[PDB]
Design a protein around this nucleic acid. Structure first.
Ligand SMILES: Nc1ncnc2c1ncn2[C@@H]1O[C@H](COP(=O)(O)OP(=O)(O)O)[C@@H](O)[C@H]1O
Ligand SMILES: Nc1ncnc2c1ncn2[C@@H]1O[C@H](COP(=O)(O)OP(=O)(O)O)[C@@H](O)[C@H]1O
Ligand SMILES: Nc1ncnc2c1ncn2[C@@H]1O[C@H](COP(=O)(O)OP(=O)(O)O)[C@@H](O)[C@H]1O
Ligand code: BEF
Ligand code: BEF
Ligand code: BEF
Ligand SMILES: [Mg+2]
Ligand SMILES: [Mg+2]
Ligand SMILES: [Zn+2]
Ligand SMILES: [Zn+2]
Ligand SMILES: [Zn+2]
Ligand SMILES: [Zn+2]
Lengths: 366, 337, 369, 373, 366
DNA sequence: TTTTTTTATGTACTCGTAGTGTCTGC
DNA sequence: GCAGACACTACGAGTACATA
């Protein structure tokens, strides 16, 4: 049994070689140059937003550090050490789920055993995951070890929130900022993996997944698995559109034109109709934000408009022809605040109603 | 008592979800975005019944194997539940840590393992973080189930590692038919309850079954007395209770409908009580109505969020500030960026 | 029908009942958890106690004609109701509704019960491997490597023993990343190759269960738990899902430097040097020269200790520093006459074994300051 | 140079002489004069921000007090005690990681053995690092020992936040606050280190590293190591600018100039150029806010520009000569609100663009005209 | 060690007669009258501010009680036991650091040593330092001993925090509370030691040392030793001022002084100095808000100033009297808004500086 | 003349109990 | 032995404090 439970894409498609890593070119180049030149450090801190790949990058660094080929920038992936660390049975590599072993007793017990020799590999790599969840005493216990560790031990911290670490911990480590993946990178990676697994898909669906993933490969991959489960083995545009939440109709522009006209009757009728269609309120607010942004953008510079969708942008030119920029700016700010406070509402529909009523109250007479 | 009360609107989804597990390609982590009391617990329970069954058939448990018997008895070495401790509305990191440490050992009955959290929105930050990695890469044949009011309310890191299933509430006509079958009361009040429960039939049914309907009627009467006179302080007698957020939400919905009536919206959340909403609309200007609505919802959010807050002080101050807002010549709050 | 006719004698069950009770109901985790199951089968009464992790069953022989079935009772109540009866007692247990009535002469007592369907228990399962082990063999096997278990370490797979069966040999491997112990013994039985990771608690409970060479032990290992039958007692503990590391790649491959010495002399010397060693860093630096072993130590107070041993050494002069506790433990485990040490490099691990028998092996990983 | 295995820039270049410290003059002079005059107090606490030299200065003092020659402020590099303490594991110095010995059960064991005479040297130097981590009972145990210690025991206490110490502990010992380093000192030290290691460097990259170090030398030196890794073993302006994830002003100065001139087309063009470079959008707002804050600095007082911004100084002054303070207040507030609202924007580029649009549209001197009526 | 100057002023200048303790007349006179007139209690518990003389006065009591020339306030200092108490150790004076011996397993032995007759002196004297750290069971044992004390033993407990002691121990002990030394007394003493130590000094430096002493004479002596260190054996005004400026931590109060004074350059210099020390900026804003709230409370009523802010009482009083309330409210509003906007700033330093610049724009100078 | 306190997690400390190593006249 | 005695070590509980 080759770990059947790995059928989940997020567990099967994690890279095993530096070349397999998508994006993050700066940190990859820095790691490769450090390994090749011999400029090896003892405390790496990969910090970035969630689902970007710092755990996988750290595991690849550990693979490169503990390979029998030597201190190589590209792990072989077939040596005994590489196979063992893939299996997770490698003694010399210690993965600490710091969000669970956050107590200081465990940290002190671990640090009292740093002097001993590694079993097989050259280095005794410490993969401390979710460092920010350690207790303050646990942080302060790490200072002396991180400053001057023995030559056979290396700490590979990996946090999703670097600012919560004490400055004394950030000071001893090489901070690698894992840049959030762009839309194109996510789309290309999703296409590559789906074509590898022979799964039906449409480029538009992949574009929607990449845009709605909010700059994360793990989010995009989880959404892809959700779409696969929903659509019976195919990533179809209609299924992923109904799943993620899309506005194929022009009800967003109608809502904007009703609100900017201070037509509460039309605004509430459109809200009722959209709710009757099971609209996703957050995606709706995002669409209004985009429409208002394009309206202001074309108000500043003529043309340079929603030429992509000519139909609505004509009426958008009318809107930009009438509405003063200050009203557009305040409408956008109020919609954004409503999106921010949408979770803090008894109901999403009620939150959208709050946002639109606040927008109406600015110019209720006109 | 309350148990796996299966609901008809779960039928199209359940048969789907079990399919994702029948092929064996299902995600180990399934976060259910379902409104409270709408049926997420029953669906998760049935899914776990299918999962832990040694000899299942079709889309239901056999009910004969020892796993089914142990599951029915409420004790099972491979069925962990993460629920708030008795008398405390939070899920400590200690319970999550104990469960995660138990997951290291094999399943006793030779089957799979199930870890079900009653409500992921009640996770403490430490507990959710202790569950992060366990969610990410669980051992062979391990299944996680999470339920939430709002997925975006969860931690931005935990929600990433989970296939998210959304349970769509039934259409309003289907829900009102179902509750009319369940409860023999007026259509107006039933529709008002469904709209109050954000369209979730289960929450409206629970509202009618409990004393919350009598409390809502009393609050409506108190509002009727207080709107013309400004004696909002008396509302305290109806507002201060262990279920204060629900009554604050009822008041917020009433203010919603008053603003709608001023704007003339065709449909309202409170259709059963037209007199009170008309009185609120005519007596109170929309400008002050918006401020009162915002303050009421802010107080509701503060009361829900910070644990240990005192209901008496918050509700009394909200009522006094509302009375102050009623008086002319007083500046009104503006939303902050 | 509520038959449940139990007819047993008290003194023949008090020791089994105390044995199966053990960690009896004191944990309020589950009401059913704090209970003991009485079952009738094969002409014998099975007393079962389980806390969802460890299961213990006593198979006590019956006396009078019985009535088959099963029902669970409060464990502490049953333990206390038969521990004070004067000498022998004709325990007659009967079912009445949801009640056990225990009678012996003029002594009638009641215990409210639960049906056996609720009690978690393991039925028959296809064993992956089966051992017929002499008690002395398993006692030596566990004893010589129990000190090498990881005590609550981050690596969860190290929190126990690896029982690896290969051919007609059974091996136990225990390590924590600093010390390692391997003990292999023959069985004279063609057994399929298999690997088992039994947790710390399971092996400790198993170790404090077997005694007396008169009752051979029967070990049944499946894919999810391990059971041990010692005489009429049955123990069951779940397995660890992890994968134990390849120990044959942990032992040094080319131990060029050879040392042989007396076990008693080495043990006495190491204890004498450890008298003045560091309190929490009990590590000695050892120099090997031609037929000479110099062991030195110190403390923060700089109370150095030095001793010289006349050994049979083959190799070049060498320095290596290792902790004293692991080596004292290995020497104590190796109840032998000559200890053979294998050294490769001043940065490499040290092997320790019996010089007169190739049945055990130990690895000590030095200290790099 | 030798650079044996390149044993980290931070660890390799630890100071070894009192003339090698990068300029904590207020504590260096006091320690040198106390050592010269024989006024050797038995307890003093080093405090200050991260990576300034508290532990290094403590090791230097142990060097000076354990030297084979007379007690001097200039320890020799040949002395056996000095060499041992440089390599560590010294007999007299007792490295005590207080974070690993917070429990009073260890401080009592420490106190039980204080009276034993040192094996070598003169003063058994007790170096307690991260003193603020000790438990309350540990501090109270340390109290009477610090008040009247044995004549041959010196206490070397170091921490980061001395305010967490009990006040009587602060009373029993001297206090040395190590100020955060200035930018010029960091730049000079980085130049020295890179020259001694024979690595190519440029002035702008080193100035950027010093600015990003935020006054702590260990941060500067780790950042220099990471920049060496980022380049092909060479420190350049491009490499450091890419690594720090920021733009070297200028571009942001053009951004703010197009903002204040109501040249929305130029604003959009520069945003497109930044997108082509692919810089963090929050970095754009942060840099624009920083430049507006620096212009406010210049507005308050003319002597509010350092040499770091000298490359644009003549330009920057002209900004402070034309923008009224209320207009810069409005600009800063609008950009700050935009940064507040950026994470909730439909896209980060959308949020930055809308922030710039709001900043230019609300410009009082050149507002965006109302379209028709 | 080498050369007599190594003696720390906090140790060498330990008072040896009741005429040497300074500023504690209300306890010295009481002890002298009690010893002379025969009035005596079973136990005497000392308390007060750090470095005021509790341990020194307790040692003086131990000297006085155990002189063979009669129980008297003033010991001769010539005979055997008077010197043995100070130089070397005296058998019948039992000095116990209660912090080192908190566990009952040591106090039990101590009270097993009370039934034995004294060797040299008439009164078996116990001096227990830091008595507020004894364990609860040790407190029970000490109370049991104090319930029926033999006539040949008298206890002496010295502590800094009297509130932690059991009330039943306070009930049987005649507590002597020592007030913090005045600035004038500290200055006169420092001048006395400096003149008698052949160390040059200047009166302004002595006044600065006394003010910075915070009332504890040990702090004054330590700062004196550091001032001698900072320089060449000379207490110069410039060196002392520089050292205090280096060690000063009242950045917030001087900063609000400069802000209300509308001195922008002073505010910027103070921000620079706070940055040099690595002062937490959010903590600085919180402290400033607290100071503004306290000064407003002072404006409402002079009773708002408690003993907690005695060090900065005069400055806050004068800045309250000279500043109208409206400026205080405006500054509080500006600082609160600035703290609200601080996290969303390019960095904390520029954010707090920008808040201060916003505050300075109100009512500026020519 | 009887009346008033928020949580969740972690870190020490001090004491009795509780279980076990070991070894000395029993 | 040996088991008691004694030594010693670990765990729990109860309490106290810190932090956000
Ligand atoms: N740079 C990358 N290259 C390839 N896959 C990636 C990358 N980053 C993330 N992934 C995908 O995301 C999944 C989780 O990645 P992970 O490294 O755990 O992110 P994190 O930094 O948030 O822990 C991986 O299994 C892999 O499929
Ligand atoms: N004043 C300084 N002079 C020279 N190097 C310094 C200085 N401060 C810090 N460093 C560098 O930082 C490294 C560690 O400094 P350290 O003294 O541990 O700072 P900390 O005060 O945080 O413990 C030193 O090896 C040295 O290279
Ligand atoms: N009233 C005082 N008169 C003279 N010296 C004092 C006085 N108070 C404190 N000191 C000085 O401080 C040193 C320590 O004083 P001590 O009385 O131990 O303070 P504490 O109250 O904290 O125990 C003494 O050696 C003495 O030099
Ligand atoms: F989610 Be990753 F470990 F930052
Ligand atoms: F990193 Be230092 F010792 F504060
Ligand atoms: F400084 Be005192 F002895 F508490
Ligand atoms: Mg990770
Ligand atoms: Mg240090
Ligand atoms: Zn390899
Ligand atoms: Zn079944
Ligand atoms: Zn020297
Ligand atoms: Zn005398």
């Amino acid at each position: 049994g080759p770990h059947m439970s790995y059928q989940v894409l997020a567990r099967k498609w994690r890279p095993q070689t530096f070349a397999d890593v998508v994006g993050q070119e700066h940190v990859l180049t820095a790691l490769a140059n450090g390994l090749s030149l011999g400029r090896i450090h003892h405390a790496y801190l990969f910090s970035g937003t969630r689902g970007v790949g710092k755990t996988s990058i750290a595991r690849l660094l550990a693979k490169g550090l503990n390979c029998e080929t030597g201190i190589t920038a590209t792990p072989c992936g077939v040596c005994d050490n590489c196979r063992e660390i893939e299996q997770g049975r490698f003694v010399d590599l210690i993965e600490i789920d710091a969000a669970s072993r956050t107590k200081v007793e465990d940290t002190r017990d671990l640090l009292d055993n740093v002097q001993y020799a590694p079993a097989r590999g050259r280095f005794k790599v410490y993969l401390i995951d979710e460092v920010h969840m350690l207790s303050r005493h646990s942080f302060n216990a790490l200072l002396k070890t991180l400053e001057e560790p023995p030559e056979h031990v290396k700490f590979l911290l990996a946090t999703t929130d670097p600012q919560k670490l004490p400055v004394t911990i950030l000071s001893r480590c090489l901070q690698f900022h894992l840049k959030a993946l762009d839309v194109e990178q996510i789309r290309h990676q999703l296409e590559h993996i789906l074509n590898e697994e022979h799964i039906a898909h449409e480029p538009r669906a992949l574009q929607l997944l990449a845009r709605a993933a909010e700059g994360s490969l793990r989010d995009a991959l989880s959404l892809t698995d959700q779409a696969i489960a929903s659509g019976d083995g195919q990533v179809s545009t209609q299924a992923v559109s109904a799943m993620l939440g899309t506005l194929d109709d022009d009800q967003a522009l109608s809502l904007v034109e009703a609100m900017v006209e201070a037509n509460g009757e039309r605004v509430m009728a459109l809200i009722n109709e959209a709710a009757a269609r099971g609209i996703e309120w957050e995606a709706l607010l995002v669409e209004m934000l985009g429409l208002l942004h394009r309206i202001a953008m074309v108000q500043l510079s003529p043309a340079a408009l929603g030429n992509d969708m000519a139909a609505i942008e004509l009426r958008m030119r009318e809107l930009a022809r009438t509405i003063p920029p200050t009203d557009i700016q305040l409408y956008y700010q109020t919609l954004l605040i409503g999106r921010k406070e949408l979770p803090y509402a008894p109901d999403r529909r009620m939150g959208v109603e709050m946002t639109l009523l606040r927008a109406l109250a600015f110019h209720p007479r006109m | 008592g309350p148990h796996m009360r299966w609901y008809p609107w779960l039928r199209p989804d359940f048969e789907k979800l079990v399919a994702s597990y029948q092929a064996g390609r299902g995600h180990h982590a399934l976060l259910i975005q379902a409104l409270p009391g709408m049926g997420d617990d029953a669906l998760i329970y049935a899914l776990s019944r299918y999962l832990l069954c040694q000899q299942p058939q079709g889309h239901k448990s056999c009910g004969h194997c020892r796993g089914c018997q142990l599951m029915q008895a409420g004790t099972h070495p491979d069925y962990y539940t993460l629920a708030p401790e008795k008398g405390k509305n939070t899920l400590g990191v200690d319970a999550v840590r104990e469960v995660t440490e138990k997951l290291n050992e094999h399943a006793r009955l030779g089957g799979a393992k199930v870890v079900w959290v009653t409500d992921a929105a009640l996770l403490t930050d430490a507990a959710a973080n202790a569950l992060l990695k366990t969610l990410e890469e669980p051992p062979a044949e391990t299944w996680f189930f999470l339920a939430t009011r709002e997925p975006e309310r969860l931690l931005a890191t935990l929600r990433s590692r989970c296939r998210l299933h959304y349970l769509a509430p039934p259409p309003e006509q289907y829900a009102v038919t179902w509750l009319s079958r369940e409860v023999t009361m007026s259509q107006d009040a039933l529709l008002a309850a469904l709209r109050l429960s954000a369209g979730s039939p289960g929450a409206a049914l629970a509202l009618f079954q409990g004393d919350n309907w009598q409390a809502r009627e009393t609050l409506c009467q108190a509002l009727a007395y207080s709107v013309p006179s400004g004696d909002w302080y008396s509302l305290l007698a109806a507002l201060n209770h262990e279920q204060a957020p629900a009554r604050l939400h009822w008041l917020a919905t009433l203010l919603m409908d008053a603003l709608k009536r001023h704007h003339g919206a065709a449909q309202v959340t409170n259709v059963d009580v037209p007199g009170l909403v008309a009185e609120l609309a005519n007596h109170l200007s929309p400008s002050r109505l918006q401020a009162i609505l915002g303050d009421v919802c802010h107080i509701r959010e503060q009361l829900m969020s910070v644990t240990g807050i005192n209901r008496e002080l918050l509700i009394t101050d909200l009522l006094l500030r509302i009375e102050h807002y009623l008086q002319p010549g007083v500046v009104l709050p503006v939303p902050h960026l | 029908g509520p038959h449940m006719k139990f007819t047993v004698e008290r003194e023949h069950l008090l020791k089994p009942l105390q044995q199966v009770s053990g960690p009896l109901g004191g944990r309020p985790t589950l009401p059913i958890l704090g209970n003991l199951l009485l079952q009738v089968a094969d002409g014998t009464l099975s007393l079962t106690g389980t806390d969802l992790e460890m299961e213990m069953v006593a198979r006590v022989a019956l006396v009078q004609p019985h009535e088959p079935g099963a029902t669970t009772v409060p464990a502490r109540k049953f333990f206390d109701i038969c521990r004070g009866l004067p000498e022998g007692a004709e325990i007659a247990v009967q079912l009445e509704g949801e009640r056990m009535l225990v009678r012996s002469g003029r002594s009638r007592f009641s215990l409210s019960t639960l049906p056996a369907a609720d009690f978690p228990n393991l039925d028959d399962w296809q064993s992956e491997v089966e051992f017929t082990l002499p008690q002395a063999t398993m006692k030596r096997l566990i004893e010589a490597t129990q000190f090498s278990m990881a005590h609550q370490d981050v690596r969860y797979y190290l929190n126990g023993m690896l029982f690896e069966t290969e051919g007609e040999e059974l091996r136990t491997v225990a390590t924590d990343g600093h010390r390692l112990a391997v003990c292999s013994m023959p069985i004279g039985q063609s057994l399929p190759s298999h690997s088992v990771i039994v947790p710390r608690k399971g092996v400790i409970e198993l170790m404090r269960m077997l005694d007396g060479g008169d009752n051979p032990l029967r070990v049944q290992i499946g894919s999810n738990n391990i059971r041990a039958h010692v005489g009429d007692f049955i123990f069951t503990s779940k397995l660890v899902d992890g994968r134990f590391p390849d120990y044959r790649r942990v032992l040094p491959k080319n131990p060029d430097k050879h040392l042989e010495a007396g076990c008693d002399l080495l043990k006495q010397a190491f204890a004498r040097a450890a008298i003045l060693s560091n309190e929490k860093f009990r590590g000695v630096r050892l120099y090997v020269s031609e037929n000479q072993l110099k062991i030195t130590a110190n403390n923060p107070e700089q109370e150095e200790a030095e001793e010289i041993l006349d050994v049979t050494y083959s190799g070049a002069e060498m320095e290596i520093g290792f902790n004293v506790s692991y080596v004292l433990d290995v020497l104590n485990a190796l109840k032998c006459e000559n200890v053979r040490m294998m050294l490769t490099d001043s940065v490499s691990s040290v092997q320790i074994e019996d010089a007169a028998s190739q049945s055990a092996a130990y690895v000590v990983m030095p200290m790099r300051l």
